[PDB]
Amino acid sequence: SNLALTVRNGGNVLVPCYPSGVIYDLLECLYQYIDSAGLSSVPLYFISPVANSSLEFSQIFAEWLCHNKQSKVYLPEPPFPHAELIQTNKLKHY
Amino acid sequence: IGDKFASRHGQKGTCGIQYRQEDMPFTCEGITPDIIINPHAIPSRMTIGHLIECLQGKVSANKGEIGDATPFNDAVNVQKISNLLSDYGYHLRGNEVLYNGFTGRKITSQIFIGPTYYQRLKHMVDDKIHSRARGPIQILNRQPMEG
Amino acid sequence: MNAPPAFESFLLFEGEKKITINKDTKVPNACLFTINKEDHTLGNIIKSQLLKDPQVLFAGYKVPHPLEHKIIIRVQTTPDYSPQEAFTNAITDLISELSLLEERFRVAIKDKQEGIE
Amino acid sequence: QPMIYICGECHTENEIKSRDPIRCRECGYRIMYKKRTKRLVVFDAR
Amino acid sequence: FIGKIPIMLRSTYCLLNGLTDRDLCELNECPLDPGGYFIINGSEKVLIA
Amino acid sequence: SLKQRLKGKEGRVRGNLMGKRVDFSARTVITPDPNLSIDQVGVPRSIAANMTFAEIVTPFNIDRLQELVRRGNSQYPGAKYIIRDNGDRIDLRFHPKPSDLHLQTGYKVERHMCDGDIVIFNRQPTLHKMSMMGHRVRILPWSTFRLNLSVTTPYNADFDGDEMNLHLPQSLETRAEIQELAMVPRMIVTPQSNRPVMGIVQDTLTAVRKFTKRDVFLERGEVMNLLMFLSTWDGKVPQP
Amino acid sequence: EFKHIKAFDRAFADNPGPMVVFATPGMLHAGQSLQIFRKWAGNEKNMVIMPGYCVQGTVGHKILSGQRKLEVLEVKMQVEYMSFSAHADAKGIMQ
Amino acid sequence: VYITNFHVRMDTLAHVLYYPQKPLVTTRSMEYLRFRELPAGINSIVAIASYTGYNQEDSVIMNRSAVDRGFFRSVFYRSYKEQESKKGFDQEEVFEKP
Amino acid sequence: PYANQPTVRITELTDENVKFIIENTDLAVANSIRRVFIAEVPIIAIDWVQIDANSSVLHDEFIAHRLGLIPLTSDDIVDKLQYSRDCTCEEFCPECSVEFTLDVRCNEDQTRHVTSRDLISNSPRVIPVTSRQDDILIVKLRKGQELRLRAYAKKGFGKEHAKWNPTAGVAFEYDPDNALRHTVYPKPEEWPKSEYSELDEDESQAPYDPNGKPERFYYNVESCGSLRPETIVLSALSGLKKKLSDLQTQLSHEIQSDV
Amino acid sequence: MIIPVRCFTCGKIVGNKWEAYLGLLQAEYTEGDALDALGLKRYCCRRMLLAHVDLIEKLLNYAPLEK
Amino acid sequence: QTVGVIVRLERETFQVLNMYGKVVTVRHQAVTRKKDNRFAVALDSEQNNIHVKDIVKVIDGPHSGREGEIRHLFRSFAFLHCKKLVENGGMFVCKTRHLVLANELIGQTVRISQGPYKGYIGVVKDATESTARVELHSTCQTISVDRQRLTTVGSR
RNA sequence: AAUAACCGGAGAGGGAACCCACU
Ligand SMILES: [Mg+2]
Ligand SMILES: [Zn+2]
Ligand SMILES: [Zn+2]
Ligand SMILES: [Zn+2]
Predict the structure, then answer these.
(1) Taking a C-beta distance cutoff of 8 angstroms, is the pair G62, G50 a contact?
(2) What are the C-alpha distances in Å from G60 to residues G66, G81, I225?
(3) Which residues contact F143 (CB under 8 A, 6 or more apart)?
(4) CA I100 to CA F99: how far, in whole Å?
(5) Measured in angstroms, how far is the CA atom of residue D46 from the centroid of ligand 3?
(6) Domain containing C28: what range?
(7) Rounded to 5 degrees, what angle do the CA atoms D22, D28, D32 make?
(8) Which of B128, F26, G6, J16 lies most in the core, judged by the most C-beta atoms within 10 Å?
(9) Are K130 and D38 in contact, with CB atoms under 8 Å apart?
């Protein structure tokens, strides 16, 4: 809610977070919520010297995820949705 | 081009070709006419009321008042209107010199000009043009539909 | 529904080039220059300049159709004089006139703005 | 899933689900309009 | 009860009687509409003498 | 009843057998244009791209026909239907597999007409036989038929919202015979009173009179401009 | 994520110039590969590699054997019987 | 402007114009029709003279700059309708995305 | 055989307009100088309107139309900007455009006049001419409804649309006394003395000139407020020079291809 | 429906003149004099502000059925 | 999944041969008619093009050594008719290879991000391999343009 | 120790009368 309000106000939002762990849950939530307010215009920048490597490593590890995601793998598709985000170009990692 | 504009006297017509302002001619000042109705319409239609309206409109616009045009007045006519034109400085009979916008040379013959009133009619072109290429067919007989 | 897009009056697309030239067979030493997407902005002043030089026998310009933005200039110049070089000389003279007129207006405008007192 | 409609006389926002009476929740008016879209729109000034 | 009979707008029994411009604009009807036509099945019909 | 179904204008005899609907026939309002010759008529891009003309695939033009076919529908110069020799009818409006786009001699191509094509062009009431003329099509941007002014005398049209029907002959032999008979300049004189009918429109009539006044004088630049447009011109200025 | 390997197209079978194409199945019994094999059988310039054992008594064995007439159509291009099996060698089992 | 409350009134085939203007020259009787309050058509400086030969018979040559600045730009309306119908269980018409 | 030496001079200048005279020049070049003012004098005007929510009684497309025609101060930043269709970037970039915002929510009983002063701009160099006199009206608003839109303005010129045309009115003429006799008066008494005439009261008709050509052309250019008239004229001449240079380059390449 | 922000023929900005013009007319001036004071010299610009009809007040008179 | 060819009609049922050569009896309403591709093609393992109503010999399978006219074609099967075969009206089914002759973008808002129409926002109606029709949001017109110039702004 | 299953597999459904309006 706060992120949406700030972006609507037109400011800029900064978010500190390790490039792993809670970031992925946060990204799923944001992926589901962005379309709620239709903020497709505002892009997400993920800046870190290990951003790309962390994303790819999260993608490959399927056997360790939850059952839902392991099934999402058995149905050929990358388990996390930030891959779909990157393919859609809303989120850019640098 | 293809619309239907109708004056207040039955001088119907369709917008032949649309020119840009630079190509459109002008009088000495920056005024450039908006519509060029053909000269040859008047001599057979005998709608001189159109000319009188155009003249009176120029007079009224210069004067700053809405000139009246009651049918049976008999108190106002061409001579009074021409006198008012003499007062306001334009030509007696409403003609003015115009300039070609392509070459720039002055138009050899002075021209009639002035304001008037137009109404674009409901017969837009987009509502009439259509074409068929082996579409549907009626049920009773194997022929093209209608409308 | 069919109105041509507005910019079609000045933009040139691929497959066509601004200028084309063709030789005339009716009379010797005559050439036709076709200019695409151009209107009486230049089609007049080119003739007005070229008629100045006496080396040219005929110079003309015509638009095949106003809705089709295109102009053709046919010129027949005196023998030993090439239409190409005559045309280029006329245009460069016109450019010089235009630029020097610009400068004269520049100096006049400073004169006026600072005052004619 | 449910859509956002406008009463008219109340000017009040209300929700309605399919196959339901078309009445404002407090005045029960019968005329019901539909709200603008959320999809973008952009006109060239021409 | 016998039945229903149409009434033209701006009649002496119509709802649009005695209400000035303010009232009619409140009711979102043009105050300038001359009235004198029957509304039927939604469409707006007129009698030709 | 059957008798009512036959007797009236809508009966099978008159309004359905002698006069029956037909395709390949556009309709719209006309608009004057002097620039183009008497034999030409302008048409809009929409009609020219929605109207169809058949073509037999031949090696002389097979390259161009294939270069046109792969363009597909929705592109003005293009074809929308391809019909095989055996009678198989394959449409291109649904973008089929590219394999069928191969062409060979003998096939039928349903391609849009471009300039040069002949078309018949009438205005009901078609009282005298000269309201049914042919013309060569030309493409112009805005949406209305464009025809030369001198043609409006035989049609009795005046452009004030008068519309005019346009049929496109489909077969090639019919195209040729229409070309050789109904094309306008072959009907300047009329059988009813052995006179010319194309005449001269009111405006050019007054203009030519005022121009050919006995004392008209004209300047060098103006003459050099006027002579440009004479199509049949030799190319030599006359002596003043 | 392969930079230079792209999905095959049937219509490319006729395309000129040297080419490299993988194909299925390794047994050739049905042979979408066999389609291109029949297409190019006449040419002696092309190679084909069979990196595994073929089923005896099938088109696999007919091609395995060198006779031209393999079904009656004659094979002319050159075959190389390679062995890229991923199984255990005697030393592997012993180790 | 065919009637004041055109926005709310949902007719069929309703044309309305951007810029109505009371005519410059008129009768005295016009204002008793309220025609001054709901005028239809725009004044237009006209010039009666064959200019280019593109306006021979009942034709007119229009300045395009005026059209682009608001000369007679009109808007056009159209209203549809639909009666979803419930029947004796042989047919039941309902509003739903197919 | 060479282009004569053009000679000019201004009569007087003012913010509203500029009046001047051209001497020793041809009719065709004078006419082209006029036409360039009307057509080829690029300026900045709003050209891309995106409406978040519109609720007034003017339908949206009307609002886009009206916002199209507002004038903007483009004294010099027009040269810096580079055409949108020509600028290679993502959609609009600060180089090839300018950004405007307009949000109004009439909450008071009285009607509010949404006017050009409410258009918040991004670059101070460009603003509605009224800002830097009454305001230009956009749309009136009743209590309750709102108007919220974002606009992008770019650099165009006369041909594309008449919203880019800054020359309110150009008066061009010459031979105020028909000396050249291009025009003919059947009753020269009736016609009014041109303000630039030098004839006497009785004559009111200059003598026929057996030998002469149009000269001493008179120009009166009235700015619409987008650009100062002197800047308008200078930009016109510079753009015409650019066009001529383009023609020369292309035709030189064509000649080289020919030979 | 509103004042046209520009002269159809010239281009002179006319939209901003309207409220000032109504003020002048309420100030008991003859429309011609008040117009000239507002500075409209050509009759191709005078016409709009002289014979323009303002309906937007009529349209505003109603309630917003959309809110 | 499995189509059949009627070999006999009955008072209330139909005797139909299935794809595997088994004759079954089904109700009149049990089966449904299917569109027939009269211009389909097949291959019988010897690469010579074959079509319906073409004479072919069955040289392998249970019906090896026979001949008949191709009645129906499938992806991998064919219903062949032989007059001499009295059974099942002479129809049978065998695989073709044992015979010898005798888009994403549709419905998605997009943006013309480069070209003469830079900045416009339209909707895509027709998507080809290279070009695409866009219905603009301003003009009463629709345009053609290459996919390279698009950028699926907004969208779902 | 298993192999390209049409891979934009698209025809359309009243009508009949009346009145209005354009030529
Ligand atoms: Mg007529
Ligand atoms: Zn309510
Ligand atoms: Zn940019
Ligand atoms: Zn004006």
Answers:
(1) no
(2) 11, 11, 87
(3) B2, B125, B126, B129, C1, C2, C3, F28, F44, F46
(4) 52
(5) 21
(6) 1-115
(7) 45
(8) F26
(9) no
Instruction: Quote the number of domains for chain I.
Output: 2
Distance from CA of F201 to the nearest CA of C (A): 20
Cα distance between residue C50 and residue C43, in whole Å: 11
Where is chain I discontinuous (C–N over 2.5 Å), named by the preceding residue? 132
Which residue range forms the structural domain that includes residue I68?
43-162
Q: Which two tokens stand for residue B49?
A: 């009321």
Strand (E) positions, chain F? 25-32, 40-43, 53-56, 79-83, 89-91, 108-111, 118-122, 133-139, 145-147, 163-167
- Residue I251 amino acid letter: L
Q: Are residues I125 and I47 in the same domain?
A: yes
How far is it, in rounded angstroms, from Cα F43 to Cα C66? 16
For residue D27, the enclosing domain spans 3-46
CATH number (domain holding residue C83)? 3.30.1360.10
Within H1-98, strands assigned E span 15-17, 42-43, 46-48, 59-63, 74-76
Distance B61 CA to ligand 4 centre (A): 12
Q: Residue F123, Cβ neighbours under 10 Å: how many?
A: 19
- List all residues of chain F from 103 to 162 with a beta carbon under 8 Å from chain C: 140-143
Among residues I145, I162, I179, which one ends one of the domains?
Answer: I162
Q: Which helix (H) or strand (E) holds C51?
A: none
Tell me the C-alpha distance between I152 and I48, whole Å: 5
Domain count, chain C: 1
In the annotation, is H90 catalytic? no
Q: How far apart are the C-alpha atoms of J53 and B83, rounded to whole Å? A: 30
Residue D27, marked binder: yes
Report how far residue C27's alpha carbon sits from residue C29's, in angstroms, rounded to the nearest whole number: 7
Which pair of tokens denotes residue A91?
């989120």
Rounded Cα distance, I67 and I47, in Å: 8
Q: Residue C115 is which amino acid?
A: G
- Burial profile J48-57: b = 16 or more Cβ within 10 angstroms, e = fewer: bbbbbbebbe
I51 and I155 fall within a common domain: yes
Residue F10 CA to residue F2 CA, distance in Å, equals 12
DSSP label at residue I192 = P
Measured CA to CA, the distance from residue K115 to residue D1 in angstroms comes to: 39
Cα distance between residue K44 and residue J46, in whole Å = 88
- Angle among Cα I103, I107, I112 to the nearest 5 degrees reads 70
User: Does the nearest atom of strand L lie within 7 Å of G87's Cβ?
Assistant: yes
d(CA H66, CA H42): 12
> Which of F164, F130, F132 minimizes the C-alpha distance to F147?
F164
Give yes or no for K138 touching C (CB within 8 A).
no
| CA distance between the termini of chain E | 30
Resolution (A): 4.2
Closest CA relative to residue B95, chosen from B87, B85, B105, B103: B85
Q: Where are the domains of chain J?
A: 1-67
Task: For residue J65, report the distance from its CA to the centre of ligand 2, in Å.
Answer: 11
Residue H44, classified by CB atoms within 10 Å of its CB into exposed (0-12), middle (13-18) or buried (19+), is buried
What is the spatial distance between Cα C81 and Cα C29, in angstroms, rounded to a whole number? 8
CATH 1.10.10.60 fits J1-67, yes or no: yes
Residues facing residue I46 across a β-bridge: I153
Backbone angles phi, psi at K154, to 5 degrees: 55, -110
Residue I54 vs residues C93, D11, D37, F194, G40: alpha-carbon distances, Å: 56, 16, 11, 69, 68
The distance (Å) linking the CA of B123 with the C1' of L22 is 8
Q: Please, which residues 27-66 of chain A have a Cβ atom closer than 8 Å to chain K?
A: 35, 38, 40
CB contact under 8 A, H68 and I59: no
The order of strands in the sheet holding I167-173 is I7-13, I17-23, I217-223, I167-173
Distance CA B101, CA B23 (A): 5
